[model samples]
Target: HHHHHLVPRGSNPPPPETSNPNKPKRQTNQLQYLLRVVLKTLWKHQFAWPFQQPVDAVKLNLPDYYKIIKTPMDMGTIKKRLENNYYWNAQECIQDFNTMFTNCYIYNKPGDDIVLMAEALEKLFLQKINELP
Candidate 1:
C-alpha cells in the first residue's frame, strides 16, 4: 500500500531573512559620528579655554537660524525634529554650526588661540557643507 502526504512537515524551518523587529539595528551615520566627536572636543576645551563655564550650562551658541530662513530655529526644536527620524540633513546642521560659531564671535570670551581655532573649524565646516549634495 502507498500513502500520500498532503504536507511534508519538518522539525525545523528556515531562519528569517530579516532581523527581529524587537532588536535595534546597528546603523551608523558618518556626519552624526563626526559631529559627536567635534562637539565633545569643543565641550572639553570650553571649560578652561572659553567662558570658563560648564559645558551643559553654555548657551547663545547656536546659529542665527533666521539668516537661513524667515523664521528662527532653536536647538531644542532642531534636536526634537532630528530625533524623530532615522535620516538627518547633516549639511543643514553643519551650516547651522558654522553660522553659530561665526555669529557668536563677540561672545567667545576665550583666548586668541581658542577663538582662532573655533574660527578655523567654522570655516572648515562651511566649506564641507557647501560641497555636499
Candidate 2:
C-alpha cells in the first residue's frame, strides 16, 4: 500500500505564498503583456542580437536587412518560412531571447539596457504589496 502526504514526514511545511490585498490577482493577459513589454523594449534598445529591430517591424534580416531577402517578424511564421532553409528553431531562439530579458527583470539583474527596465518591473511587482488586509 502507498500513502501520499502533502508534507514530507519530518520536513517543515513550505512557506505560504504572499499576496496583496489591494491589488487583484494578476491575469493571464497581464503576464503576457508584461513579458512582451520587456522583450519588445529590449529589442527596441538594440540589446538584442541576430536581428536589427523589434518584431513590430515589417521585416527582419538574417544578416542585417538588405534589399535581397527578408523574413516576416512573426516568429511562428518565420519558423515555417525557414523550415526548409538551413536556419532552424526560430521560435526557440526568440523565446530564449525573451526569457533572458524577462529573467533579468525578475531577478533584478543587468544587461546592456536592462537597468531601467529591471527597475521598472521590480518596482511594479513590489508597489502593490501594501498593508496586509
Candidate 3:
C-alpha cells in the first residue's frame, strides 16, 4: 500500500576574494524578483519537457496557488521513491504536475510567475513521495 503522510519534509554557491567590500547591500527584493522569474521559467521548462506538446498559457489564481504551497512533502520518502521507482514514478509525478501547470499563470510579471512555478515544483516534487513499494 502506498501511503503518503500528511507532513512534508523540506541549493547554492558563492565566490570570494573581491575588492570593494563597501558595496551597498544587495537589494534582496530585486534579487528575489529576478529569482522568481528564473524559477518560473525553469518550472515551465520542466513541466513542458514531459508533454512534448504545446500547452496553453494560464492566469495566476491566488487561492489555488495557496493550496499547493500549503501542501507539504515528505522529502525522505520522495528521495527513496525516486531511487526505487525512477522513470515510472517520475512520469507519474510529471502527469500529476500537469495539473499544477494548468493552475499557474504564464511567467510574465515577477513574483506571481515565480511563486506559481516554485509552488508547482513543490507539488511535483511532493507527489512522488510515498509512492514507493
Candidate 4:
C-alpha cells in the first residue's frame, strides 16, 4: 500500500468540524482528569507562559504588585498543588485557578497584554470547566 493508502486517507475536509460547542473528544474520580484537562488547556495558551511562572516583582520592576496583590498565585504553583493532591475539593481548585487570573486583572489594566491573556485563557478555562458533567 502507498503512504496515503496506509494512512487511511478519508474524504473529511480541512474545515472546522466543530458543528457546535459539543466537544468531539480521561481517568480517576474525574476531578483529576478535570485538573489535567484545564491545566493542559491553559498550558497550551500563550498567556499560560506568563501565568505558568511566578511573577518577579523586583526583577520585572512591577511596582506595588506585591502590595496590591496581597496573595500571589501562579499556574506553576497551582498545577503543582493540584498534582500534589493538595486541593481538598473542586472549590479549592476553582478558587486557585480564578485567583491566578484575578490577580492579573488586578495588577494590570484590561488593555494590558497579560490582562488580556488572562481574559482569553479564563474564557477557555471556564468553557472547559462548565463543560464538565
Measured by lDDT, the strongest candidate is: 4
User: For candidate 3, which ten residues in a row score worst on lDDT?
Assistant: 9-18
Task: List the candidate 1 regions with Cα displacement exceeding 4 Å.
Answer: 1-28, 47-87, 105-117, 120-133
TM-score of 4: 0.74
Model 1, span 27-52: residue lDDT tens: 24645543455343443443324422
lDDT of 2 by residue, 54-104 (tens): 232123222322222222232233222223231222343344334433544
Task: List model 4 lDDT by residue over 1-133, tens digit each.
Answer: 4556555432312321112234221123445855668788889877778887677765676757766887677877777666666655676667878888888888888698887888999899888888764
Error of 4 at 120 (Å): 0.5
How does residue 30 of candidate 1 score in lDDT? 43
Candidate 3 global lDDT: 0.35
lDDT of each: 0.41, 0.34, 0.35, 0.69
lDDT for each residue of candidate 3 in 7-95, tens digit (9 for 90 to 100): 54211112111223343334243233222442234335553342222221222233332334322222222223233332232344344
Which pairs of residues collide in model 2?
A: none
What order do you get sorting by lDDT, best first? 4, 1, 3, 2
Candidate 3 deviant stretches above 4 angstroms? 1-80, 84-90, 106-111, 115-133
Deviating ranges (above 4 Å) for candidate 2:
1-87, 109-133
